[PDB]
Amino acid sequence: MTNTLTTDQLQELLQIQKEFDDRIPTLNLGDSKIAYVVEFFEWFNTLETFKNWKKKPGKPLDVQLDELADILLFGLSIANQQGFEEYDRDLFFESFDEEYFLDFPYLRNQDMIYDMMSEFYDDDLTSIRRLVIVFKIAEQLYTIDQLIDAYKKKMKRNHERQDGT
Amino acid sequence: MTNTLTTDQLQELLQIQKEFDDRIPTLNLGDSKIAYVVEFFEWFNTLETFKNWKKKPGKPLDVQLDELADILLFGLSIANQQGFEEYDRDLFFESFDEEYFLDFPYLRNQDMIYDMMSEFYDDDLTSIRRLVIVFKIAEQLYTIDQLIDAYKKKMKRNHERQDGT
Ligand SMILES: [Ca+2]
Ligand SMILES: [Ca+2]
Ligand SMILES: [Ca+2]
Ligand SMILES: [Ca+2]
Ligand SMILES: [Cl-]
Ligand SMILES: [Cl-]
Ligand SMILES: [Mg+2]
Ligand SMILES: [Mg+2]
């Protein structure tokens, strides 16, 4: 568990997503952006920081990671659809390294979801920012390693589905 | 007729396209990319460098410019849909300034269309490259000024249509 993300790791993830999306003819960037937000809320719903009525709020770790991996899926798809070049990659690592406001205590505050919504309805939300958000969550609440593992598992199953196996 | 393109001119064009596309709910990046290529061939068909059987090949200048403006329309739309940032703009002006192979005699060769097709079926064709192509054609065969004029005229009519006037 390095809990770090390398250039080669990111490039591999983008390549994995690309191979799967190439098999989706109706691929629609506007729809992918909406799916990103919907999947984000589903992940947020597994964290359960607003569910005061629960004895043990928070779903099992493997469930939370699986729902987080959905956010990553659409984040990678959106990046690929917009053309993720070497200079986009550099800006991503700079933005990721120097993000100051997405740390553990902030992400554990249930009011964080209002800030996220303020980003989500802005036309100018970048594909880079969407990726920074999902990797900071992994880095801060989980590990980047488990997120990558859950996503790769999911995509293997996804290829089996589209293969009819 | 400066036959040049400034940063402010490009930003204005992108803003014009953005306002119009915001009124198109079914906006689909994959469809816009195909439309770019189809409109490209329509413009090429007005140049008529392959129509050996004509006495006066080439349609009137205003027709050629109008069809070129269609290429620009989809080129701007694709750029906007992919998120055209300040660094994309800088790379565009560098690519445009230092393009060596899209000059007048090349563009007047009817075999140029095979090279274009080799670019058009490549998944990795960038929105920047699509814009470099259309502005070099304007610069070399027409002027950038007439292209901008034809596009602005077209978009004014387009807003009148979507306004129901
Ligand atoms: Ca989900
Ligand atoms: Ca891009
Ligand atoms: Ca046309
Ligand atoms: Ca972009
Ligand atoms: Cl309740
Ligand atoms: Cl004939
Ligand atoms: Mg650094
Ligand atoms: Mg220069």
One DSSP character per residue, B28-94 reads: -HHHHHHHHHHHHHHHHHHH-TT-TT-SS-S--HHHHHHHHHHHHHHHHHHHHHH---HHHHHHHHH
Measured between beta carbons, which residues in chain B are less than 8 angstroms from residue A78?
A: none
Instruction: Provide the CB-side half-sphere exposure for A161 (13 A, CA).
Output: 9
Q: Minimal CA–CA distance to A105: which of A64, A148, A71, A136?
A: A136
Q: Which two tokens stand for residue B5?
A: 């393109």
Task: Point out the residue among B28, B87, B127 whose CB comes nearest to the CB of A83.
Answer: B127
Give SS3 for A161: helix
Q: Which two tokens stand for residue A151?
A: 């996503």
Method of structure determination: X-ray
* Cα-to-centroid distance, A54 and ligand 5 (Å): 9
- Residue bearing tokens 């906006």: B27
Instruction: Compute CA B146 distance to the chain's CA centroid, rounded to the nearest angstrom.
Output: 12
Number of structural domains in chain A? 1
B132, B99 contact by CB (below 8 A): yes
Q: What contacts A25, CB < 8 A, 6 or more positions away?
A: none
The pocket of ion ligand 7, defined by CB under 5 A, consists of A 97
Taking the C-alpha atoms of residue B68 and residue B130, their distance in angstroms, rounded to an integer, is 12
Q: What contacts B44, CB < 8 A, 6 or more positions away?
A: B113, B116
Region label for A164, one of left (φ > 0), alpha (ψ between -120 and 50) or beta (otherwise): left
Taking the C-alpha atoms of residue B95 and residue B143, their distance in angstroms, rounded to an integer, is 18
What resolution does the deposited structure have, in angstroms? 1.9
Give SS3 for A90: helix
* Cα-to-centroid distance, B61 and ligand 3 (Å): 14
Nearest CA of chain A to the CA of B119: how many Å? 15
What domain range includes position B55? 1-165
Q: Which amino acid is at B30?
A: G
Q: Which two tokens stand for residue A152?
A: 């790769």
Q: Count how many pairs of residues, chain A against chain B, have C-beta atoms within 8 Å.
A: 26
Task: Point out the residue among B83, B91, B124 whose CB comes nearest to the CB of A127.
Answer: B83
* Cα-to-centroid distance, A125 and ligand 8 (Å): 29
Residue A11: phi, psi to the nearest 5?
A: -60, -40
Task: Point out the residue among A81, A85, A127 whose CB comes nearest to the CB of B29.
Answer: A81
